[PDB]
Amino acid sequence: KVLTLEGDLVLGGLFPVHQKGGPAEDCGPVNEHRGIQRLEAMLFALDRINRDPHLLPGVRLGAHILDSCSKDTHALEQALDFVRASLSRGADGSRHICPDGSYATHGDAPTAITGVIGGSYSDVSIQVANLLRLFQIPQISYASTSAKLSDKSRYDYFARTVPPDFFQAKAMAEILRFFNWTYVSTVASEGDYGETGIEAFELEARARNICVATSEKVGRAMSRAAFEGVVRALLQKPSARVAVLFTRSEDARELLAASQRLNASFTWVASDGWGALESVVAGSEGAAEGAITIELASYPISDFASYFQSLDPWNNSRNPWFREFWEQRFRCSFRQRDCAAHSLRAVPFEQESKIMFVVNAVYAMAHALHNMHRALCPNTTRLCDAMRPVNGRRLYKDFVLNVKFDAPFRPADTHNEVRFDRFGDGIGRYNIFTYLRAGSGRYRYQKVGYWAEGLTLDTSLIPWASPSAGPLPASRCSEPCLQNEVKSVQPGEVCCWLCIPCQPYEYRLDEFTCADCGLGYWPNASLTGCFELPQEYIRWGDAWAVGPVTIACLGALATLFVLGVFVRHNATPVVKASGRELCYILLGGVFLCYCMTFIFIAKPSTAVCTLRRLGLGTAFSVCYSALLTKTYRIAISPASQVAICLALISGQLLIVVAWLVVEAPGTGKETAPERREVVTLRCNHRDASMLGSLAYNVLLIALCTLYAFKTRKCPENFNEAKFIGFTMYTTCIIWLAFLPIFYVTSSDYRVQTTTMCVSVSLSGSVVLGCLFAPKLYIILFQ
Amino acid sequence: KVLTLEGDLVLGGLFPVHQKGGPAEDCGPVNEHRGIQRLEAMLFALDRINRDPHLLPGVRLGAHILDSCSKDTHALEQALDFVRASLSRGADGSRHICPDGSYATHGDAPTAITGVIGGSYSDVSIQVANLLRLFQIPQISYASTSAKLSDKSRYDYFARTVPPDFFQAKAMAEILRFFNWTYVSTVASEGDYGETGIEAFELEARARNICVATSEKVGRAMSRAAFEGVVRALLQKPSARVAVLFTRSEDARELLAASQRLNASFTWVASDGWGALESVVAGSEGAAEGAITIELASYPISDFASYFQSLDPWNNSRNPWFREFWEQRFRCSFRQRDCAAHSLRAVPFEQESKIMFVVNAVYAMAHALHNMHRALCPNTTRLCDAMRPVNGRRLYKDFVLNVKFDAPFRPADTHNEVRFDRFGDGIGRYNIFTYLRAGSGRYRYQKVGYWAEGLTLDTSLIPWASPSAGPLPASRCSEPCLQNEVKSVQPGEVCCWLCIPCQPYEYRLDEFTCADCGLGYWPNASLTGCFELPQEYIRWGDAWAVGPVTIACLGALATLFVLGVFVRHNATPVVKASGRELCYILLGGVFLCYCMTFIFIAKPSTAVCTLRRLGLGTAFSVCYSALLTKTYRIAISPASQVAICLALISGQLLIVVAWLVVEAPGTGKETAPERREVVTLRCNHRDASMLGSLAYNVLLIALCTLYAFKTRKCPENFNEAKFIGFTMYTTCIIWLAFLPIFYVTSSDYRVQTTTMCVSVSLSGSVVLGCLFAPKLYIILFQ
């Protein structure tokens, strides 16, 4: 059937009056929820346009409406009808079986259609758009929610009033960023609807500072085992309790039913698939707590409802499908003439949510036509003779794309308009519905805000945001930490991470990995890396170092007293027949060893440690030489004993200096604990062959001293002989005690060194006392 | 007009009978080169199909041909006619001015078209493909060379027989890789054809081991200044002498004219735009030398020509445009009845290159129809009643894509077939034409090879490759070099580079950059990097080192002789009242200095450096102490002089050893030349405070010796006194001479050290001789 209303400017019309019915019938039984209501809405819109004094005052508006019944071949044939009526007006009727006349001259062909207002489903809209691409005719839809038509490459002459899916994805992104829900999951659908929406959502996510936890898809219909598996995979992540949904109504209902059966609480926000329908939450009211829903902006129209109420098949015979709709709504037949008793005013009527979009499309087309007529021939309001061929390219790319007008039948409360972007898509105007948990009984959706160009909503109506009694429901991954514990570990996630402290001795210079520097130095607080840290020149405490200094001072005082007693008693008979010069050399050696023991506790460094070990070796050599001379020079001439003593001392000094110079006495800093500040404590001259050769030389010197001491028949000055014997015995005992002590305490930092220094000082003091005792006894006797 | 031929299965046809003529007429005057020839070819093809016993023996074949005249609206309306005839057969004629009957029942509507054979230009092909995409009808073209239709997303039910532009780009890539022409330039065009070809060529280039020099584009038509500028930019590169061209015929002719005007020799290969046309090379014969041309594979048909020769408007009234073509070819009108005198056999006829392609398209459609009829209803050869509704989806995606048949009117020489790829495009078969420089007069194209699936051509007909007298003309960038000079520099090119040698001391580890290692070591030949190179322990030559060794041996022999003379003459009066022990100490010091001078020419190392400098300092101190003792101990006790001498020697030794240990005597290797092998020649103990303190101590010792030399009234042993005076004078002179010599030659490698060693050896020998002369004189006197 064809619905034709006369007029100079006629517009196309497409509405699915019927529904799917299989290949048995033509295309299916007549529908009464989508097609007839939108058809009557378009008729009312054109009636108001014809009666509008401000809009199109001179010329009227025609109407050419064809059935679509949600079919493909039928819609294609109806588009062929439109194109044959529009373009084929140039060629007359060809030769056919018509014997009355050759061709039609005035009738049998309507005027060229200016535009078409039709196409609700995705497939029919795609087909109409692809068919009307080449014929240079504009096309506007009213329920085209598919986002695959936004591209102008495949669909150029196509516009829509409802917002596409990427607008809804942007609204989802805005409502997620408003609540700081960076860590969010997504659920897709295997149908035609949802894939482009999820793609746009993921693109907007990866665009600006937000990521996604997981990406799952749900099929059309299968066993509940797959639903249980996918919901378990969703709830597997403990930190994932918020997710977006882009599925249908039945799929959302079954998902909520499965969630209620599994008894798990979540905070779910969905797309327009949920909507304001109540059948999707039937039997699952205690499972959608704290849910956010996106509703398409649509307000009821009082004038359209009043016009639809006063409808009857008696005085309104224009619409051919009106009788079919009347027979479908009320079970009756017009043959028996019994349908007149029924009235439409008695039965309650609910307006379709798409009526406002249809009337907006019609009024936008009317405004575009008015603007074209005003900008083309402004001489008079009558029809211009220069616009008889409908030029769709100009009317599309010059007028309808840039429209600025207020919404029709809009209440004084709202302030909205109708515009189109560069892609010919309507602006995204949505409403936010919250699952309010009102204590007055049942739970129902509550309007809390709207999203047109900017997100403007309040928390005064949100149940989990109004009192702020507890923490705001949000999913976060790695937010809590500062620039003190920088380590980051990522098991399987790239967007977020796990903020973990690193080692305290490791520098902090990168926000993804922790760099571990050397153990001998600590990082700096200037945020530049890990380098050396300044140490102290003096490390030993004053109280502990006072002992060695006091011992050295006492030894020096004893040596000075012995030297003074030897100088004063220079004419004594005991010192005359003895090594007076050798006694002075021994006193000088004692002074030198005391000075070396005092300097051994100075600021440690390379030269410090080398001088300390050289002084220790020289002290050992000079004490051995002094003992050997006292054992030898007493009895082998008086000038050869000191000569060979100095010779052996110089030889031992050269040996030890060679042994210490052949090695590599560095100045490294080593700390015993794992994480501690490294300070200079000991020299790098660790266990090597130098100390072994020094110990071997000391042992050889001790053996020579013992061989010289083996004499026991000395009848002259037995007191000094027994004193030297006791002194060498004490020295050997101290050396034997310090050998295993130093060998076992070598791992110590300052205990072994201090113990060895104290032992050396005590041995030197004992030797000085034993040397001074013979001179004191000789002075007391004579 | 419509050409209708009876048949159960009717095939569609579209041909541009007319051409562009402006909006004044309908669409333009009738053509006689493209439309009528292809229309007659299709008519002859269907005529042969009807008489073919092997192909469609039972059922005939219909025809429905509509005019296109290379337009958009006309072709759109004629495709509208096809769709109205095919799909609208379900519904009868609507109510119209026809008063004879309600609607047509048998006539006024032909059967549904099974397929359509039409579309030559790009725009008409795009329009037909976009229109017939929705009605599930297959479409095959005969001259659709546009490559933007290969995608199945926008054009799914579209097939072609001519190869698209990407096949030609692949053929160009193959013929370029055959000649090893990696470095090539490209010239594009601003028209509709050429952009996708250049894009595919660049994609194939960047795909596998070949790059492009430049990418220029030429507009449609402008002044010659732009052409001169673009050709100058093309010839700017000296190594660029090979170019590909994807332009039209007129553009190629104008470019050849500009090149002949500029007088530049080039080797240019072009696309099918050049072809075998002779008007494009008129006036520019001496400019396209050594040119390669791609020609579309097309062979003449004898049967089609014989059928076209026997044509007349008397017994052939089917074609409506035949009368228009006859009136266009011969200037006459059928009103005067004077056109019968002219005959088509008299005037020569040239077959169009697209005749074979449309014939192959029609025969492929017939083969697909036969295969479908055989695989659907194999019961009988008659038409099946189950295939009355033409199902285009199965007929397309099951039969026309996979066809295996030989080409019609196939000459026994060639071996080719007709196939379609996954995108429904014909296989790429081209011919290679070479600008042969034959000495028989004018120059013309010569067929040298064909390209269907693999490049098979010979050089026996190529003028620049048959004798191989000179090098093959090829453009290369950075081919000549090996893994010996690895450096690479790239001024403005990324694909190729410039192969330049690097520094010989720099290791080779990457083919893009040269890594320069340290100067103190040379890279290895094992291709592992740059590390240290083994040196020699001994560096001084044997002949040069024999001098110092001989001097040391002579000094040691002199010292031994002096010691033996002193030991034998131990009872001499001169040696009795003198320092005999001091003489032995001086002899030992001479032996020590000789040993130090001998060891100073050993293998250089850290310990070697320390021992050498310590021995030099000890020798200086020992000679100073020996001189001081000889000046002092001769006259202040006999046991105190040697004591203070040994004390001063030990003090100087401690001073010099401290000065040498406080420094950092490394073991680095330094080479004087910039690029030479580094060997251990000079030590790390460079100019510092240690040598300054040593020189200061030596100067103080020399000043003390000179102060002791002030005695001039010695009456005992004046001979030894004057000998010691001459010795100390010679030593001071040698030291003063070696000071500035060393200060000036420190920059040398081995001259300064050898000179200093020789001077030290000479001074030691002179001192030994002066010391032995007094003992020798005393022995001679007594």
Going by C-alpha positions, the residue among A624, A658, A660 that lies closest to residue A644 is A624
Nearest to A83 among B80, B135, B643 (CB): B80
Going by C-alpha positions, the residue among B102, B99, B135 that lies closest to residue B116 is B135
d(CA B73, CA A134): 9
Strand B113-118, strand B139-141: pairing: parallel
d(CA B145, CA B513): 46
CB neighbour list of residue B255: distance below 8 Å, 6 or more residues apart? B187, B218, B227, B231, B245, B247
d(CA A266, CA A292): 12
Containing A755, the helix (H) or strand (E) segment is helix A751-781
d(CA B157, CA B663): 91
CB A437 within 8 A of CB A467: no
d(CA B294, CA B285): 18
Chain B nearest CA to A650, separation (Å)? 8
First-to-last C-alpha distance (Å) of chain B: 157
| SS3 call for B450 | strand
Q: Give Dmax over CA atoms of chain B in angstroms.
A: 177
Going by C-alpha positions, the residue among A369, A343, A351, A327 that lies closest to residue A41 is A351
| Interchain contact B83–A (C-beta under 8 A) | yes
Quick one: A368 exposed, middle or buried, by C-beta within 10 A (0-12, 13-18, 19+)? buried
CB B523 within 8 A of CB B503: no
Q: How far is CA A719 from the centre of its chain?
A: 90
**Helix pair angle (B73-86, A73-86), 10° resolution:** 130
Length of chain B: 782
CB neighbour list of residue A696: distance below 8 Å, 6 or more residues apart? none
| Interchain contact A88–B (C-beta under 8 A) | yes
| SS3 call for B603 | coil
d(CA A633, CA B673): 62
d(CA A196, CA A169): 10
Q: Give Dmax over CA atoms of chain A in angstroms.
A: 177
Phi, psi of A212 (to 5 degrees): -130, 145
Ligand-binding site membership of A272 (annotated): yes
CB A89 within 8 A of CB A109: yes
Containing B756, the helix (H) or strand (E) segment is helix B751-781
| Interchain contact B599–A (C-beta under 8 A) | no
Q: List, in sequence order, the alpha helices (H) in B146-214.
A: 165-178, 195-207
Q: Hey, which residues does B62 pair with through a beta bridge?
A: B10
d(CA B411, CA B297): 13
CB neighbour list of residue B281: distance below 8 Å, 6 or more residues apart? B253, B256, B288
Q: Which two tokens stand for residue A145?
A: 């929610």
DSSP output for A138-196: -EEESS---GGG--TTT-SS-EESS--HHHHHHHHHHHHHHTT--SEEEEEESSSSSHH
**Solved how?**
cryo-EM
CB A30 within 8 A of CB A322: no
> Exposure string (b/e) for A487-516, b if CB count within 10 Å is 16 or more?
bbeeeeeebbbebeebeebbbbeeeeebee
| Interchain contact B88–A (C-beta under 8 A) | yes
First-to-last C-alpha distance (Å) of chain A: 157
Q: Which residues of A touch B104 (CB under 8 A)?
A: 96-97
Q: Give the resolution in Å.
A: 3.6
d(CA B38, CA A306): 65
Q: Which residues of B touch A104 (CB under 8 A)?
A: 96-97
**Hey, how many other C-beta atoms are within 10 angstroms of the C-beta on A15?**
29
CATH number for the domain spanning A186: value is: 3.40.50.2300
CB neighbour list of residue B414: distance below 8 Å, 6 or more residues apart? B299
Q: List, in sequence order, the alpha helices (H) in A533-688.
A: 542-568, 573-576, 580-599, 606-632, 640-661
Angle (CA) B329-B67-B358 rounded to 5° is 80
**Hey, how many other C-beta atoms are within 10 angstroms of the C-beta on B488?**
18
* Residue from A4, A26, A74, A80 to probe the interface with B (highest B Cβ count within 10 Å): A80
Q: Which two tokens stand for residue B284?
A: 């520019």
Would you give the DSSP letter of residue B549?
H
> Exposure string (b/e) for A612-647, b if CB count within 10 Å is 16 or more?
bbbbbbbbbbbbbbbbbbbbbbbeeeeeebbbebbe
Nearest to B104 among A73, A93, A97 (CB): A97
Nearest to B610 among A87, A639, A661 (CB): A661
CB neighbour list of residue B61: distance below 8 Å, 6 or more residues apart? B7, B8, B9, B10, B11, B46, B49, B50, B366, B369
DSSP output for A467-484: S--S------SS----TT
d(CA B20, CA A523): 82
d(CA B93, CA B339): 42
Strand A116-118, strand A139-141: pairing: parallel
Going by C-alpha positions, the residue among B610, B583, B586, B587 that lies closest to residue B599 is B610
**CA A627 to each of CA A134, A571, A575, A586, A639: distance values in angstroms, whole numbers, following the listed order:** 123, 23, 16, 9, 17
d(CA A98, CA B305): 42
Phi, psi of A10 (to 5 degrees): -105, 145
Going by C-alpha positions, the residue among A10, A25, A110 that lies closest to residue A70 is A25
| SS3 call for B257 | helix
Handedness of CA A154, A160, A164, A167 (dihedral sign): positive
Strand A417-418, strand B139-141: pairing: unpaired
CB A493 within 8 A of CB A477: yes
CB neighbour list of residue B177: distance below 8 Å, 6 or more residues apart? B210
d(CA B171, CA B297): 13
Going by C-alpha positions, the residue among B40, B7, B2 that lies closest to residue B113 is B7
Length of chain A: 782
d(CA B773, CA B779): 10
d(CA B293, CA B267): 11
| SS3 call for A88 | helix
Nearest to B87 among A77, A107, A643 (CB): A77
Which residue of B lies nearest to A73 if distances are taken between CA atoms? Answer: B135
d(CA B468, CA B471): 7
Going by C-alpha positions, the residue among B454, B425, B419 that lies closest to residue B165 is B425
Handedness of CA A14, A18, A22, A23 (dihedral sign): negative
CB A583 within 8 A of CB A572: no
Residues contributing to the annotated binding site of B for L-glutamate:
34, 38, 122, 143, 145, 272, 354
CB neighbour list of residue B489: distance below 8 Å, 6 or more residues apart? B497, B498, B500
Going by C-alpha positions, the residue among A286, A296, A235, A245 that lies closest to residue A268 is A245
Nearest to B134 among A130, A646, A650 (CB): A130
CB A128 within 8 A of CB A82: no
DSSP output for A487-507: -EE-SS-SSS-EE----TTSB
Tell me which residue has tokens 């109510």: B95
Handedness of CA A563, A569, A574, A577 (dihedral sign): positive
CB A588 within 8 A of CB A646: no
DSSP output for A705-737: HHHHHT-----S-HHHHHHHHHHHHHHHHHHHH
Q: Which two tokens stand for residue A198?
A: 């999820």
Going by C-alpha positions, the residue among A9, A127, A782 that lies closest to residue A372 is A9
Going by C-alpha positions, the residue among A605, A630, A574 that lies closest to residue A781 is A574
Residues A444/A448/A453/A455 CA torsion (nearest 10 deg):
-120
Q: Which residues of A touch B134 (CB under 8 A)?
A: 76, 127, 130-131
DSSP output for A336-373: TT-GGG--TTTS-----TTHHHHHHHHHHHHHHHHHHH
Angle (CA) B14-B20-B23 rounded to 5° is 110
Strand A159-160, strand A116-118: pairing: unpaired
d(CA A376, CA A415): 31
d(CA B80, CA A134): 11
Helix%, strand%, coil% for chain A, nearest 5: 45, 10, 45
Phi, psi of B353 (to 5 degrees): -70, -20
Q: Which residues of A touch B76 (CB under 8 A)?
A: 87, 134-135
CB B139 within 8 A of CB B129: yes
Tell me which residue has tokens 């309600």: B102
Q: Which two tokens stand for residue B579?
A: 């320092």
DSSP output for A572-610: -HHHHTS-HHHHHHHHHHHHHHHHHHHHTTS--SHHHHH
Helix%, strand%, coil% for chain B, nearest 5: 45, 10, 45
CB neighbour list of residue A266: distance below 8 Å, 6 or more residues apart? A235, A241, A242, A243, A259
d(CA A114, CA A86): 9
Position B726: which residue type? F
d(CA A5, CA B563): 148
CB neighbour list of residue A606: distance below 8 Å, 6 or more residues apart? A665, A666, A667, A683
d(CA B197, CA B147): 8
| Segments forming the whole domain that contains residue B269 | 165-299+430-457
Handedness of CA B365, B367, B373, B376 (dihedral sign): negative
Would you give the DSSP letter of residue B474?
-
Going by C-alpha positions, the residue among B429, B435, B430 that lies closest to residue B461 is B435
d(CA A480, CA A491): 18
Q: Which residues of B touch A642 (CB under 8 A)?
A: 643
d(CA B770, CA A100): 159
Position A173: which residue type? A
Q: Which two tokens stand for residue A610?
A: 């080398």
Going by C-alpha positions, the residue among A766, A764, A761, A758 that lies closest to residue A742 is A758
